[PDB]
C-alpha cells in the first residue's frame, strides 16, 4: 500500500475552487513537500459529508489508489484530519464536457471517435476491477491532453452516498447500479460529445425522465452522427440491461469507426481537423503526458 | 535525425514569466506555453542565447538543435523546441527543483549516502548514453545536472558549448591547453562534479585564479579528498583526473563502481547522522512520480 500517500495538513494548501459537484468541492492546490522549497500544483477534492469510520474511508481510498490504466485517474493521496480531502493530479485542460463546448463545431471526427474509444477502455478496466462508476458523464472525463482523456470520480458515489439524466432506467426506478447501467451512462456521455456539449433532455424535468424512457423516447440523433453511431447510443439505452453493449464491444466498434472517421461522422471542415502531427504530438507528450487510433490512409 | 523530434515555435506561442538564472551561454527563464487555440498555460523552461544571431548562423544552430532534440535517455534532458527569433530561444522541460548543485547546498548536511551515490550512478548513465551517441558535452558540472525529483536527476545543457569565459575549473588539462574535447575530457568533468556533490556544493579550487589552474594541474595538484569520502570513492575521482586521457575511467566502468557502492552506501561514504537521513521510499516515490515524473526510468 505504497500506492496511497497520507498527507499532513501542513503539506498542502487549497488555492482556488475549480468547481463543485454532488459529492464535493474541487480546488486547485499546491503540495509543499516537507523540507523542500518547491510548490507543486495538485487537485484537491474536499468531500461533502455520516455512515463511515476513518478506517473504512481509508480502505475505499486504497482501492481508488490501486487503479492502473492510462484512461483512468488514480487517487494519489488523502488527508483525513477534518474533512476527507483527496489529492489527485491537476488537469489544466479540465473536463471533457467543458472542452467540447469550448471547441464546439471545431473538433474533428478523429478526436470524437478516439475519445469514445478511450472512455470505453477506462470503463472496461473498471469493469475488470469490479468497480462500478455510478456517475459517468462528460463532466467526469478529464482531458490530460486533447489527444488523451481519462475517466474520473468513480466510486465516490459509493463512498459518500443525483444525475438522473445520465442514469439507467433501473437505477432511477430501483436504485440498482451495475456495469450495464454504466453502459447507459456511457451512451449519454457519447451523446454529449457528439452534440458538442448539449444538455440532455434539456427542458425536461428530472421526474419526467423515467416516464419518457418507458414510453420509448430517447435522446435525439445528433446532426453530425451517421446512423451507425446513433445506433450504438440507442443500444446503450435499451430497457433490458443484458441487451446493452459490453464495454469491450464498444471499444471494438468505435475503434473500427476510428479507422475511417469521415465515413461515420459528418463534420463541415473535417478534413482540416486531423490529429496532431508527430511533431506536435511529441511536444505535447514531453510537456504534459510522459505516461491512438488513426485513419487508415 | 528525426525532425519530428524538434518543434518550431512561433513567438506568439510562449511568454517569459521569471528569470531563473544566467550562464556563459545564455539566460534561462520560466515560461508559459499557450497552445494555439487553447485556454491553458503550460509551464516551460526557455533558454535565450546571449548573442543575437544571423539567419545563416542559425541554420548551424538548427542542425545542432535537431541532434539535441534527438537525445533519448532518462538521465539526459532533451531539447523540446526552438524559436529562431532575432535572438534564438530553446524550450525544454521546466524543473522546479532546479540544479543539483543548488539542491546539495540547500540540503547540505541533511543528505544521505544513498542519495549521493545514486546521483553519481545516474549522471554516469546519462554521460554513457552521450558517449554512445558520439556526443561530447564539454560543460558537465553539478550546475548542469537538473533535479527532476530528489530520486531522479538529469544531465542538461548538452551541446551548448559547441554552438557557442570557459569553465576552467571543470576542464581537463588538454582542454585548457589545446581546446581538445573528448569523452575522456568529459570524464574529467564528471570527477569534478562528483567532488562537488561529495562536498555538498563547495567551489572547486576556491581561492585559486582560473588563469593559474593549468599550472597547478601540471604540478600534479588535485581537488582534496572530501570529508565524507572513503578512499575507494576518492580514488575513482582521482582516476578521472589522470593526465593521460586514456588512463581515465570509462563512463561504463563508473556506472558499475558507483552502482556497487550504492548497494552498500554506508560503507563508502561516512556521514554524520546517515542513520537518521531520509531514504527514498516507495510511497514517496510513487507520489513524486505521479505528480512530477511519469517518464520510463
Ligand atoms: N483533477 C482535476 N483537475 C482539474 N479539474 C478538475 C479535476 N477534477 C475535477 N475537476 C473539475 O472540478 C470541477 C468540479 O468537479 P466535481 O466536483 O467532480 O463535479 P462534477 O463532476 O462536475 N459533478 P458530479 O457528477 O456531481 O461530481 C469540475 O469542473 C471538474 O472539471
Ligand atoms: N530546465 C530548467 N528548469 C529549471 N531551471 C533550469 C532549467 N535549466 C536551467 N535552469 C537553471 O537556469 C539557470 C541558468 O543556467 P545556465 O544558463 O545554463 O547557466 P549555468 O548552468 O549555471 N552555467 P553554464 O550552464 O555552465 O553556463 C541555472 O540556475 C539553472 O539551474
Ligand atoms: Mg466529478
Ligand atoms: Mg547550464
Which domains, and CATH codes, for chain A?
Answer: 1-90 (3.30.200.20), 91-284 (1.10.510.10)
Residues 6 or more apart whose CB falls under 8 angstroms from that of B84 comprise: B8, B53, B55, B58, B61, B62
Experimentally, how was this structure solved? X-ray
Q: What residues of B are in the A interface, CB distance below 8 Å? A: 3-7, 33, 35, 37-42, 44, 78, 80-81, 93, 96-97, 106-107, 110, 150, 278, 281-287, 290-295
Which residue do the cell numbers 540547500 mark? B106
Distance A151 CA to ligand 3 centre (A): 9
How far is the alpha carbon of A225 from chain B, nearest alpha carbon, in Å?
A: 25
Enter the C-alpha cell of residue B238: 582521482
After which residues does chain B show a gap where C to N exceeds 2.5 Å?
Answer: 164
In the Cβ-directed half-sphere of A33, how many Cα atoms lie within 13 Å?
16
Hey, of B1, B33, B40, which one would you mutate to test binding to chain A, going by the most A CBs within 10 A of its CB? B40
Question: E strands of B34-164, at which residues?
Answer: 42-49, 81-83, 89-92, 145-149, 152-155
Catalytic one of A59, A68, A135, A153:
A135
Q: Report how far residue B66's alpha carbon sits from residue B72's, in angstroms, rounded to the nearest whole number.
A: 12
Q: What dihedral angle (degrees, nearest 10) is formed by the CA atoms of B1, B3, B5, B8? A: 140
Do the beta carbons of residue A76 and residue A87 sit within 8 Å? yes
Backbone angles phi, psi at A26, to 5 degrees: -105, 130
Task: Report which ligand 1 atom has the smallest distance to the Cα of A92.
Answer: 4
How far is the alpha carbon of A72 from chain B, nearest alpha carbon, in Å?
A: 13
In the Cβ-directed half-sphere of B164, how many Cα atoms lie within 13 Å?
17
Number of Cβ within a 10 Å radius of residue A22: 12
- Which residues of chain A lie closer than 8 angstroms to B7, CB-CB? 279-280, 282-283
Q: Report how far residue B85's alpha carbon sits from residue A168's, in angstroms, rounded to the nearest whole number.
A: 56
How far is the alpha carbon of B150 from chain A, nearest alpha carbon, in Å?
A: 10
The number of residues in chain B equals 297
The closest alpha carbon to A147, from A295, A277, A256, A296, belongs to A277
**Apex A161 CA angle, A155 and A164, nearest 5:** 80
Enter the C-alpha cell of residue B66: 535537431
Q: Is B161 in the pocket of ligand 2 (CB under 6 A)?
A: no
The closest alpha carbon to B192, from B175, B179, B180, B178, belongs to B175
Distance B159 CA to ligand 4 centre (A): 11
Do the beta carbons of residue A139 and residue A185 sit within 8 Å? no
Which residues of B carry out catalysis? 139
The DSSP symbol for A279 reads H
Whether B286 and A89 lie within 8 Å, measured CB to CB = no
Cα–Cα distance list, A31 to A35, A39, A76, A106, B218 (Å): 12, 6, 12, 36, 50
Q: Give burial (CB, 10 Å; 0-12/13-18/19+) of B11.
A: exposed
Backbone angles phi, psi at A128, to 5 degrees: -60, -35
The closest alpha carbon to A213, from A178, A246, A173, A244, belongs to A173
Task: Report which ligand 1 atom has the smallest distance to the Cα of A156.
Answer: 27
The number of residues in chain A equals 297
Output Rg (C-alpha) for chain A, integer angstroms.
Answer: 20
Q: Report how far residue A161's alpha carbon sits from residue A48's, in angstroms, rounded to the nearest whole number.
A: 10
| Total CB pairs under 8 A between chain A and B | 72
Q: Report how far residue B124's alpha carbon sits from residue B251's, in angstroms, rounded to the nearest whole number.
A: 6
Q: Report how far residue B170's alpha carbon sits from residue B125's, in angstroms, rounded to the nearest whole number.
A: 19
Report the b/e string of A134-150 with b at 16+ CB within 10 A. Answer: bbbbbbbbbbbbbbbbb
- Which residues of chain B lie closer than 8 angstroms to A287, CB-CB? 33, 42, 44, 80, 93
Q: Report how far residue B9's alpha carbon sits from residue B221's, in angstroms, rounded to the nearest whole number.
A: 48
Number of Cβ within a 10 Å radius of residue A297: 3
Whether B33 and A4 lie within 8 Å, measured CB to CB = no
What's the resolution in A? Answer: 2.0
Q: Report how far residue B204's alpha carbon sits from residue B193's, in angstroms, rounded to the nearest whole number.
A: 9
> What is the C-alpha end-to-end distance of chain A, expressed in Å?
46
Enter the C-alpha cell of residue A107: 473538433
Do the beta carbons of residue B55 and residue B64 sit within 8 Å? no
Amino acid at each position: 500500500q505504497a500506492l496511497l500517500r497520507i498527507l499532513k495538513e501542513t503539506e498542502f494548501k487549497k488555492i482556488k475552487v475549480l468547481g463543485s459537484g454532488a459529492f464535493g468541492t474541487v480546488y486547485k492546490g499546491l503540495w509543499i513537500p516537507e523540507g523542500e522549497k518547491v510548490k507543486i500544483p495538485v487537485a484537491i477534492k474536499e468531500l461533502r459529508e455520516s455512515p463511515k469510520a476513518n478506517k473504512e474511508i481509508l480502505d475505499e481510498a486504497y482501492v481508488m489508489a490501486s487503479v492502473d490504466n492510462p484512461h483512468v485517474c488514480r487517487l494519489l493521496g488523502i488527508c483525513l484530519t477534518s474533512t476527507v480531502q483527496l489529492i489527485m493530479q491537476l488537469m489544466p485542460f479540465g473536463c471533457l464536457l467543458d472542452y467540447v463546448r469550448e471547441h464546439k463545431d471545431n473538433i474533428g471526427s478523429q478526436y470524437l471517435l478516439n475519445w469514445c474509444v478511450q472512455i470505453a477502455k477506462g470503463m472496461n478496466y473498471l469493469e475488470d476491477r469490479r468497480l462500478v462508476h455510478r456517475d459517468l458523464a462528460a463532466r467526469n472525463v478529464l482531458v490530460k491532453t486533447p489527444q488523451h482523456v481519462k475517466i474520473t470520480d468513480f466510486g465516490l458515489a459509493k463512498l459518500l452516498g443525483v444525475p438522473i439524466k445520465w442514469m439507467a432506467l433501473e437505477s432511477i426506478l430501483h436504485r440498482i447500479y451495475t456495469h450495464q447501467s454504466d453502459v447507459w451512462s456511457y451512451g449519454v456521455t457519447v451523446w454529449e460529445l457528439m452534440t458538442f456539449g448539449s444538455k440532455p433532455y434539456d427542458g425536461i424535468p428530472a421526474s419526467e425522465i423515467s416516464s419518457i424512457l418507458e414510453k420509448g423516447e430517447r435522446l435525439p440523433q445528433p446532426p453530425i452522427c451517421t446512423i451507425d453511431v446513433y445506433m450504438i447510443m440507442r443500444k446503450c439505452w435499451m430497457i433490458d440491461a443484458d441487451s446493452r453493449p459490453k464495454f469491450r464491444e464498444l471499444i471494438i466498434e468505435f475503434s473500427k469507426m476510428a479507422r475511417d472517421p469521415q465515413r461515420y461522422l459528418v463534420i463541415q471542415g473535417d478534413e482540416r481537423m486531423h490529429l496532431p502531427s508527430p511533431t506536435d504530438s511529441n511536444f505535447y507528450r514531453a510537456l504534459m503526458d510522459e505516461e491512438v487510433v488513426d485513419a487508415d490512409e
